[PDB]
Amino acid sequence: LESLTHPGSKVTFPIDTPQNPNLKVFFFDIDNCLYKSSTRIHDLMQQSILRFFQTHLKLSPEDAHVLNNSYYKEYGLAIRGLVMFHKVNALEYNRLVDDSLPLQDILKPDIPLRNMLLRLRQSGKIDKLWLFTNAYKNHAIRCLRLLGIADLFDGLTYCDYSRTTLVCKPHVKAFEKAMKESGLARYENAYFIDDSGKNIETGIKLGMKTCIHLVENEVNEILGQTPEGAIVISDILELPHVVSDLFLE
Ligand SMILES: [Mg+2]
């Protein structure tokens, strides 16, 4: 990644103190949000995860599918279950999974996306664009850099796989962490986009101003139906359509 030279190829916000309490923050999911689910990256991840269940838990493929979906469904991350019940080391799992995707051959600079996010930053209606992902920081950063958007965000809340289980979406504590890290004072000053219906559900219940459910094709049942109060779009470039006012001075 260090040989990338395109705009947005370098992270410009710190990773890892009172603030203006009127801060407005737009939280961005990453996987299947900042890139399309139709990249099939999610399918690549799942293949790798299923391989891990087989090689490390010694499960047949069908038992692997079932347990993976069960953990994913209850926790928002299979790895949460693997840590708690199977005493798996999440960083080693992560090394084999997310961190071994052929992303460099899949993700390329998304110029329309870059330009859309720039307009959102430049309206003055939103104070911070804050990343909020269940991925570990390695993968999250890699996605931003390849997509050419690593300079367009003010911070990153990611799931800390160092824990031995993980605080993650859709659990409330993950949202409380994003609020604290981003400097957000009230959920009312927050907006949120994510492809997972369950994640959006939590954002809505907590009192976030506007939550957008991003469903490129059909809903993944495991991730949840579109919840009540949510706005649905099929591509992140449709944000200008549904929260137009945030793009206007
Ligand atoms: Mg996502």
Coordinates of all heavy atoms in Angstrom, one line a residue, residues 29-33 72 132-134 169 193-196 199 223, ligand 1:
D29 N -20.2 3.2 8.1 CA -19.9 1.8 8.0 C -18.8 1.7 6.9 O -18.8 2.5 6.0 CB -21.2 1.0 7.7 CG -21.0 -0.4 7.4 OD1 -20.1 -1.1 8.1 OD2 -21.8 -0.9 6.6
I30 N -18.0 0.6 6.9 CA -17.1 0.4 5.8 C -17.4 -0.7 4.8 O -17.7 -0.4 3.7 CB -15.6 0.2 6.4 CG1 -15.2 1.5 7.2 CG2 -14.6 0.0 5.2 CD1 -13.8 1.4 7.8
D31 N -17.3 -1.9 5.3 CA -17.5 -3.1 4.4 C -18.9 -3.1 3.8 O -19.9 -2.9 4.5 CB -17.3 -4.4 5.1 CG -15.8 -4.6 5.4 OD1 -15.0 -4.5 4.5 OD2 -15.4 -4.7 6.6
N32 N -19.0 -3.2 2.5 CA -20.3 -3.1 1.8 C -21.0 -1.8 1.9 O -22.2 -1.7 1.6 CB -21.2 -4.3 2.2 CG -20.5 -5.6 2.1 OD1 -20.0 -6.0 1.1 ND2 -20.2 -6.2 3.3
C33 N -20.3 -0.8 2.3 CA -20.8 0.5 2.4 C -20.0 1.5 1.6 O -20.5 2.0 0.6 CB -20.9 1.0 3.9 SG -21.6 2.7 4.1
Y72 N -22.5 -14.9 13.8 CA -22.7 -13.7 13.0 C -24.0 -13.0 13.4 O -24.1 -11.8 13.6 CB -22.7 -14.0 11.5 CG -22.4 -12.9 10.5 CD1 -21.9 -11.6 10.9 CD2 -22.5 -13.1 9.1 CE1 -21.6 -10.6 10.0 CE2 -22.3 -12.1 8.2 CZ -21.8 -10.9 8.6 OH -21.5 -9.9 7.7
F132 N -17.0 3.8 11.4 CA -17.5 3.0 12.4 C -17.6 1.5 11.9 O -18.6 1.2 11.3 CB -18.8 3.5 12.9 CG -19.4 2.8 14.1 CD1 -18.6 2.1 15.0 CD2 -20.8 3.0 14.4 CE1 -19.2 1.4 16.1 CE2 -21.3 2.4 15.5 CZ -20.5 1.6 16.4
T133 N -16.6 0.7 12.2 CA -16.5 -0.6 11.5 C -16.3 -1.7 12.6 O -15.7 -1.5 13.6 CB -15.3 -0.7 10.5 OG1 -15.3 -1.9 9.8 CG2 -14.0 -0.5 11.2
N134 N -16.8 -2.9 12.2 CA -16.6 -4.2 13.0 C -15.2 -4.8 12.6 O -14.8 -5.8 13.2 CB -17.7 -5.1 12.8 CG -18.9 -4.9 13.8 OD1 -18.8 -3.9 14.5 ND2 -19.9 -5.7 13.7
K169 N -20.8 -3.6 16.7 CA -22.1 -3.5 16.2 C -22.7 -4.9 16.0 O -22.1 -5.8 15.6 CB -22.1 -2.8 14.8 CG -21.3 -1.5 14.8 CD -21.2 -0.8 13.4 CE -20.3 -1.6 12.4 NZ -20.4 -1.0 11.1
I193 N -24.9 5.5 8.2 CA -25.2 4.6 7.1 C -24.5 3.3 7.2 O -23.3 3.3 7.7 CB -24.8 5.3 5.7 CG1 -25.2 4.4 4.5 CG2 -23.3 5.6 5.7 CD1 -25.0 5.1 3.2
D194 N -25.1 2.2 6.9 CA -24.6 0.8 7.2 C -25.5 -0.2 6.4 O -26.7 0.1 6.1 CB -24.7 0.5 8.7 CG -23.9 -0.7 9.1 OD1 -24.1 -1.8 8.6 OD2 -23.1 -0.6 10.1
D195 N -24.9 -1.3 5.9 CA -25.7 -2.2 5.1 C -26.5 -3.2 6.0 O -27.3 -4.0 5.5 CB -24.8 -3.0 4.1 CG -23.8 -3.8 4.8 OD1 -23.1 -3.3 5.6 OD2 -23.6 -5.0 4.5
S196 N -26.1 -3.2 7.3 CA -26.8 -4.2 8.2 C -28.0 -3.6 8.9 O -27.9 -2.6 9.6 CB -25.8 -4.6 9.3 OG -26.4 -5.2 10.4
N199 N -27.7 -3.1 12.7 CA -26.9 -2.0 13.1 C -27.6 -0.7 13.0 O -27.6 0.2 13.9 CB -25.7 -1.9 12.2 CG -24.7 -3.0 12.4 OD1 -24.9 -3.9 13.3 ND2 -23.5 -3.0 11.7
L223 N -28.2 -10.4 8.4 CA -27.9 -9.1 8.9 C -29.1 -8.3 9.4 O -29.0 -7.2 10.0 CB -27.1 -8.3 7.8 CG -25.6 -8.4 7.8 CD1 -25.1 -9.8 7.8 CD2 -25.0 -7.7 6.6
Ligands
MG1 MG -21.0 -3.2 6.7

